[model samples]
Target: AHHNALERKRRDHIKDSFHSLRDSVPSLQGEKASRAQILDKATEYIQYMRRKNHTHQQDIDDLKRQNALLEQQVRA
Candidate 1:
């Protein structure tokens, strides 16, 4: 659906912005940062984003369910 595609693009844009912000931080730029440390930080960020995305998806599903119920009621 067009609406879903737009929503996906919006969400991807937000995710990209977050990644850009993370990469822009000075702490993440130092030569002292070990490979393991970088991996751990990146993993943490990804997990945080995943949790936020899951919540957003749940909210969207709930809204869609409500819309469907309203439509059914109107049909009846």
Candidate 2:
């Protein structure tokens, strides 16, 4: 393809991805969210999910550690 054609396709692809990201975020699902807001809210949501996953991961390890202690006492 020509340079201009490829460049045009990339621009369209980026726009599509922008809308996709906006739609994926709950707060951005509405048409009111601007492009900058879409990026901001998406980043916020990503950070929120990351922290939530970390907490959940911590709980899993905490339970595993407790089970290990309980099993050790059971064998004693």
Candidate 3:
């Protein structure tokens, strides 16, 4: 009986985490997604955002380089 209670609590926590993850994914929000689907989609979304942020960083660096070049040209 004690083991059953512990297992149930553990399962409940897992379900809670799935719900939290589902809510966090825009495409999965308010939808009934399988646990596997939630995980796959979340993983894909994270990679997508990572790539997006990487591009943003690149753009920032390019802008800073251009500003520095312009400042150097102005000083000449």
Candidate 4:
């Protein structure tokens, strides 16, 4: 059926897309091709990256404050 063919094409495209996503996000490698599973992993990885980056920025902010305080106290 033509409708069946289109449905298969759509599913195949999504699978290929997920494959690419998995390849780029190594954390999702060797995992299931299930749509939900891949999606869940992707979300988890993205959030993990976000938190990691935020922590780095927070550290930088703390260091800047410390440096400024030292400059004021040391007059250097």
Winner by lDDT: 3
Q: Write the per-residue lDDT of candidate 3 for residues 1-76, one digit (tens) a residue.
A: 9999999999999999999999999999889899899999999999999999999999999999999999999999
Report lDDT per candidate. Answer: 0.76, 0.93, 0.96, 0.85
Please state every model's RMSD to the true fold in angstroms.
16.2, 2.5, 1.3, 2.8
For model 2, residues 1-76, the per-residue Cα lDDT tens digits are: 6999999999999999999999999877877777799999999999999999999999999999999999999999
Task: Order the numbered candidates by lDDT, best leading.
Answer: 3, 2, 4, 1
Deviating ranges (above 4 Å) for candidate 2: 1-7
Question: Where does candidate 4 stray beyond 4 Å?
Answer: 1-12, 30-33
Candidate 4 residue-wise lDDT, 1-76, digit = tens: 9999999999999888988887766676775557677788788899999999999999999999999999999995
TM-score against truth, every candidate: 0.48, 0.74, 0.87, 0.65
lDDT of 1: 0.76
Error of 3 at 8 (Å): 0.4
Candidate that beats the other on TM-score, 3 or 4, i.e. the better one: 3
Q: By TM-score, is 1 or 3 better?
A: 3
Please report the candidate that would top TM-score against the real structure: 3
lDDT of 4 at 40: 80
**Superposed Cα RMSD, model 4:** 2.8
